[PDB]
Enzyme design. Structure first.
Site, PDB file in Angstrom:
ATOM      1  CG  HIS A 151      -2.110  -0.987   0.975  1.00  0.00           C
ATOM      2  ND1 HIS A 151      -2.167  -2.207   1.619  1.00  0.00           N
ATOM      3  CD2 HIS A 151      -3.210  -0.923   0.182  1.00  0.00           C
ATOM      4  CE1 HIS A 151      -3.268  -2.842   1.249  1.00  0.00           C
ATOM      5  NE2 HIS A 151      -3.923  -2.080   0.386  1.00  0.00           N
ATOM      6  CG  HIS A 186      -1.963   0.214  -4.289  1.00  0.00           C
ATOM      7  ND1 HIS A 186      -2.600  -0.664  -5.140  1.00  0.00           N
ATOM      8  CD2 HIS A 186      -2.900   0.621  -3.399  1.00  0.00           C
ATOM      9  CE1 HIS A 186      -3.869  -0.785  -4.777  1.00  0.00           C
ATOM     10  NE2 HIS A 186      -4.073  -0.031  -3.713  1.00  0.00           N
ATOM     11  CG  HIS A 238      -7.424   4.239  -3.283  1.00  0.00           C
ATOM     12  ND1 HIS A 238      -6.426   4.328  -4.235  1.00  0.00           N
ATOM     13  CD2 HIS A 238      -7.404   2.974  -2.818  1.00  0.00           C
ATOM     14  CE1 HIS A 238      -5.832   3.149  -4.342  1.00  0.00           C
ATOM     15  NE2 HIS A 238      -6.407   2.311  -3.498  1.00  0.00           N
ATOM     16  CG  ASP A 239      -4.929   2.291  -0.359  1.00  0.00           C
ATOM     17  OD1 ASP A 239      -5.787   2.054   0.515  1.00  0.00           O
ATOM     18  OD2 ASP A 239      -4.701   1.505  -1.309  1.00  0.00           O
ATOM     19  CG  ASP A 266      -8.235  -0.762  -4.303  1.00  0.00           C
ATOM     20  OD1 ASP A 266      -7.000  -0.510  -4.307  1.00  0.00           O
ATOM     21  OD2 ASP A 266      -8.902  -0.772  -3.242  1.00  0.00           O
TER      22      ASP A 266
HETATM   23  C1  LIG Z   1      -4.718  -6.626  -6.165  1.00  0.00           C
HETATM   24  C2  LIG Z   1      -4.826  -7.512  -4.969  1.00  0.00           C
HETATM   25  C3  LIG Z   1      -5.322  -6.900  -3.730  1.00  0.00           C
HETATM   26  C4  LIG Z   1      -5.400  -7.718  -2.676  1.00  0.00           C
HETATM   27  C5  LIG Z   1      -5.866  -7.325  -1.323  1.00  0.00           C
HETATM   28  C6  LIG Z   1      -7.265  -7.832  -1.034  1.00  0.00           C
HETATM   29  N1  LIG Z   1      -7.680  -7.490   0.299  1.00  0.00           N
HETATM   30  C7  LIG Z   1      -8.184  -8.405   1.201  1.00  0.00           C
HETATM   31  O1  LIG Z   1      -8.775  -8.105   2.227  1.00  0.00           O
HETATM   32  C8  LIG Z   1      -7.976  -9.828   0.910  1.00  0.00           C
HETATM   33  C9  LIG Z   1      -6.697 -10.271   0.668  1.00  0.00           C
HETATM   34  C10 LIG Z   1      -6.482 -11.604   0.405  1.00  0.00           C
HETATM   35  C11 LIG Z   1      -7.544 -12.475   0.390  1.00  0.00           C
HETATM   36  F1  LIG Z   1      -7.334 -13.783   0.132  1.00  0.00           F
HETATM   37  C12 LIG Z   1      -8.816 -12.024   0.638  1.00  0.00           C
HETATM   38  F2  LIG Z   1      -9.821 -12.919   0.613  1.00  0.00           F
HETATM   39  C13 LIG Z   1      -9.049 -10.693   0.905  1.00  0.00           C
HETATM   40  C14 LIG Z   1      -7.521  -6.116   0.706  1.00  0.00           C
HETATM   41  C15 LIG Z   1      -6.137  -5.577   0.420  1.00  0.00           C
HETATM   42  F3  LIG Z   1      -5.256  -6.107   1.319  1.00  0.00           F
HETATM   43  F4  LIG Z   1      -6.115  -4.235   0.626  1.00  0.00           F
HETATM   44  C16 LIG Z   1      -5.667  -5.867  -0.982  1.00  0.00           C
HETATM   45  N2  LIG Z   1      -5.026  -9.027  -2.830  1.00  0.00           N
HETATM   46  N3  LIG Z   1      -5.041  -9.994  -1.905  1.00  0.00           N
HETATM   47  C17 LIG Z   1      -4.593 -11.050  -2.579  1.00  0.00           C
HETATM   48  N4  LIG Z   1      -4.293 -10.805  -3.887  1.00  0.00           N
HETATM   49  C18 LIG Z   1      -4.579  -9.529  -4.015  1.00  0.00           C
HETATM   50  N5  LIG Z   1      -4.477  -8.748  -5.098  1.00  0.00           N
HETATM   51 MG   LIG Z   2      -7.341   0.704   0.633  1.00  0.00          MG
HETATM   52 ZN   LIG Z   3      -5.835   0.467  -2.757  1.00  0.00          ZN
END
Ligand SMILES: Cc1cc([C@@H]2CN(C(=O)c3ccc(F)c(F)c3)CC(F)(F)C2)n2ncnc2n1
Ligand SMILES: [Mg+2]
Ligand SMILES: [Zn+2]
Length: 342
Positions: free
Chosen positions: A81, A85, A121-122, A233
């Site tokens: 983050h 990103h 946004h982050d 996102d």
């Molecule tokens: C682009 C992208 C973004 C995210 C995450 C998804 N997010 C979760 O809460 C989350 C994470 C893993 C999981 F397995 C799940 F079920 C939920 C929120 C976040 F961390 F901000 C970004 N991931 N995660 C795994 N490949 C990703 N690819």
């Molecule tokens: Mg965010």
């Molecule tokens: Zn984001």
């Protein structure tokens, strides 16, 4: 001072044409994380110029240069983050504008708000999720835990604090009505980045896709903006396999650092944040199946030209099953040693 000289050049050197960034810069196949970070603030200006936002909204160029640098400097450097990103999410918003004819769906000011929201946004993400803010009794949870979406409320508040910094309010010549509208859109769009919010509105997104987008339906506009923000996102997953492999490394590095902190607090991390339990291929398959793929399927349902995005997400998910066997240690480890057993 370094901010100052970066500003001086950003302002006085001229806005590079978007085509000079990369000859594929406006294609869904382009990977914006390939752009050197030192070039990203200029690329933001180039995209804003190419979408005609600078002229249409008569944005003051010194203010815009200051704003863009303030936003970049408002990100920390956790593994995922970070500013790259936010930059790649903003770039995907630009791709949506260039490839999907958003002006047949959304007001100009809504598309503008979407892009600025992507940039912001982050803001000030600390590498931990909303649950951690509450569990660790952070200042952010003290402010916002009673409303939910703790981090996303913080990101929005940070965006407003940048606007309220003298010399940085790119909207301050707007009418009072348009200013209120821009800030309200930014609120809704940034808050939509909470995946809990996405999961809550998912049925309404399905129902909108089923009945057909009604450009005269204000609730359809709001729903579409949420879907598009989520699509930006998660847009790392719409690139080829090497991007998604690297982005997995970054997300789990960030997650496992949070999990190590929760263990130090005496708390059981989520399995996906626990480096001793998380099985990355199965977690990535689950994330693709249950979150990423349905989002890009809805996007394709609404925009047929988005089909390749969903197909890429599905392919990347198939890659995870194909490589999963390699997480099992065959033979001996490379050192010929079983010392890891003890
Ligand atoms: C682009 C992208 C973004 C995210 C995450 C998804 N997010 C979760 O809460 C989350 C994470 C893993 C999981 F397995 C799940 F079920 C939920 C929120 C976040 F961390 F901000 C970004 N991931 N995660 C795994 N490949 C990703 N690819
Ligand atoms: Mg965010
Ligand atoms: Zn984001």
């Amino acid at each position: 001072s370094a901010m100052d000289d970066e500003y001086t050049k950003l302002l006085h050197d001229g806005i590079q044409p978007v085509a000079a960034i990369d000859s594929n810069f406006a294609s869904f196949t382009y990977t914006p994380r390939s752009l050197p970070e030192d070039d990203t603030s200029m690329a933001i200006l180039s995209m804003l110029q190419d979408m005609n936002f600078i002229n249409n909204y008569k944005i003051d160029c010194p203010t815009l240069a200051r704003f863009c640098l303030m936003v970049k400097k408002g990100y920390r450097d956790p593994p995922y983050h970070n500013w790259m990103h936010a930059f790649s999410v903003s770039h995907f918003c630009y791709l949506l504008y260039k490839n999907l004819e958003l002006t047949n769906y959304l007001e100009d000011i809504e598309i503008f708000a979407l892009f600025i929201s992507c940039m912001c946004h982050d803001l000030d993400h600390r590498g931990t999720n909303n649950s951690f803010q509450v569990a660790s009794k952070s200042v952010l949870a003290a402010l916002y835990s009673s409303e939910g979406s703790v981090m996303e409320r913080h990101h929005f508040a940070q965006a407003i604090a940048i606007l309220n910094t003298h010399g940085c309010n790119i909207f301050d010549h707007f009418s009072r009505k348009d200013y209120q509208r821009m800030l309200d859109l930014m609120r809704d769009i940034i808050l939509a980045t909470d995946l809990a919010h996405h999961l809550r509105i998912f049925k309404d997104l399905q129902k909108m896709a089923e009945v057909g987008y009604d450009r005269n339906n204000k609730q359809h506009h709001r729903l579409l903006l949420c879907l598009l923000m989520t699509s930006c996102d998660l847009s790392d997953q719409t690139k080829g396999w090497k991007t998604t492999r690297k982005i997995a490394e970054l997300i789990y590095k960030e997650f496992f650092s949070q999990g190590d902190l929760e263990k130090a607090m005496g708390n059981r991390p989520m399995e996906m944040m626990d480096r001793e339990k998380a099985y990355i291929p199965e977690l990535q398959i689950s994330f693709m199946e249950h979150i990423a793929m349905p989002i890009y399927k809805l996007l394709q349902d609404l925009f047929p030209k988005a089909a390749e995005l969903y197909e890429r997400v599905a392919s990347n998910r198939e890659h995870w099953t194909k490589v999963s066997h390699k997480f099992t240690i065959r033979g001996l480890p490379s050192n010929n040693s079983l010392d890891f057993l003890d």
